[PDB]
Design a protein around this ligand. Structure first.
Ligand SMILES: Nc1nc2c(ncn2[C@@H]2O[C@H](COP(=O)(O)OP(=O)(O)OP(O)(O)=S)[C@@H](O)[C@H]2O)c(=O)[nH]1
Ligand SMILES: [Mg+2]
Length: 412
């Protein structure tokens, strides 16, 4: 009975958000407007007309994308007063936030009021880009003050592997606000998203639409214990806490099992489901010994019987399929959630793994390069960049890579 307000920034933020609500809607029997026991309250609000609307906030610096949603089959769903429209650069993005502060928080504070027990905020956005990273980083810094206790989680979209030129810039500046101004970071690697769409799906030119179909599934599954509540795992923090033992290190990777087909099989049990959630080919992140997990969560939908589950774990302990940390209790959690009373096993993984730092590394290597040449610094140094906050960020980020690597050490 805890609420979650969702912030959607920039094209990416709003296009994966579009898919997210399209999916939650199908599951809670809600139409592109309203209705036809699950907890709808967590993500939905009761309309003053016995109808339903999402606790969502569409924020963009360009009209193109929001008007796509508005001129679509889901225009009636969104709360009209929760949509806001005001530049390629993080700086430009961080800037326009301060300028639109009051207008933005009028919507955020109002939704915050409606809730009777607000747990926290979820921010959907991309790391590269201007809006997502810039306006995203600003909001992240403000939420950390206007609401000190409320938890903050994000589904952050990492670029593919350019054609923006300064992604490594926007990216570093944001990774900083994601390290200290965020409780939980579900990382969505566009590179890994592609490989899948392409391989385990056979699409030569995977579009964002297509790609966001995957993201929607993870976003959807990773919240099933909150929408189809049980005794344990009903708090968002009930999950995040079990996945993040120490702060800072809160960058999680995900993975899904039943990804394709329609061709039938002889038998699919929770066994091969958990076994697969451990094969890197299903892990939606791209990494390239020593590294290990810090925690692992497995959410299974459909029939199961918690006896079969004890058996799958054993086979794993003996087949050395999961390399956990060396400095402590190596354990994978299982949560048997239901599905919606509308259209076999299904599995979603959420792991806090060490090799996640690779992306942070892969970014600094790029930042550094472009930095050592004063590349494109002219467009950013066009607004309160008469010196360097870049240096502050890079160092912070190097800290994240230091502890994530420091975490695979038995010494830790
Ligand atoms: N998965 C996914 N990634 C997206 C989507 N839209 C953009 N991206 C990825 O996000 C990054 C840029 O996102 P974008 O949506 O341009 O941010 P923006 O802030 O809205 O951009 P701007 O307005 O400053 S130019 C790129 O790495 C791109 O690959 C989307 O709908 N889905
Ligand atoms: Mg945009």
């Amino acid at each position: 009975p805890r609420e979650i307000i969702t912030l959607q920034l920039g094209q990416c933020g709003n296009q994966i958000g579009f898919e997210f609500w399209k999916q939650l809607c199908a599951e809670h029997g809600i139409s592109p407007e309203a209705i036809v026991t699950d907890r709808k309250d967590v993500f939905f609000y009761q309309a003053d007309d016995e109808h339903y609307i999402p606790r969502a906030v569409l924020l963009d610096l360009e009209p193109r994308v929001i008007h796509s949603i508005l001129n679509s089959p889901y225009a009636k769903l969104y709360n009209p007063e929760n949509i806001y429209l005001s530049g390629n650069n993080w700086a430009s993005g961080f800037s326009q936030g301060e300028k639109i502060h009051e207008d933005i928080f009028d919507i955020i504070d109002r939704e915050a009021d409606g809730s009777d027990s607000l747990e926290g905020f979820v921010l959907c956005h991309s790391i590269a880009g201007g809006t997502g990273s810039g306006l995203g980083s600003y909001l992240l810094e403000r939420l950390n003050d206007r609401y000190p206790k409320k938890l903050v989680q994000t589904y952050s979209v990492f670029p593919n592997q350019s054609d923006v030129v300064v992604q490594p810039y926007n990216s570093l500046l944001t990774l900083k606000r994601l390290t200290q101004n965020a409780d939980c970071l579900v990382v969505l690697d566009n590179t890994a998203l592609n490989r899948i769409a392409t391989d385990r799906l056979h699409i030569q030119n995977p579009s964002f639409s297509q790609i966001n179909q995957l993201v929607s599934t993870i976003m959807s599954a990773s919240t099933t214990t909150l929408r189809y509540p049980g005794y344990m795992n009903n708090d968002l923090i009930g999950l995040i806490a079990s996945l993040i033992p120490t702060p800072r290190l809160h960058f999680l990777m995900t993975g899904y099992t039943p990804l394709t087909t329609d061709q039938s099989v002889r038998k699919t049990t929770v066994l091969d489901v958990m076994r697969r959630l451990l094969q890197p080919k299903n892990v939606m992140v791209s990494t390239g010994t020593n590294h290990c997990y810090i925690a692992i969560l497995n959410i299974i939908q459909g029939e199961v019987d918690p006896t079969q589950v004890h058996k799958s774990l054993q086979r794993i302990r003996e087949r050395k399929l999961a390399n956990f940390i060396p400095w402590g209790p190596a354990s994978i959690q299982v949560a048997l959630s239901r599905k919606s009373p509308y259209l076999r096993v299904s599995g979603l993984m959420m792991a806090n793994h060490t090799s996640i730092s690779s992306l942070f590394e892969r970014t600094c290597r790029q930042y550094d390069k472009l930095r050592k040449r004063e590349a494109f610094l002219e467009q950013f140094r066009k607004e309160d960049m008469f010196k360097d906050n870049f240096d502050e960020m890079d160092t912070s980020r190097e800290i994240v890579q230091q502890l994530i690597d420091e975490y695979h050490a038995a010494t830790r």
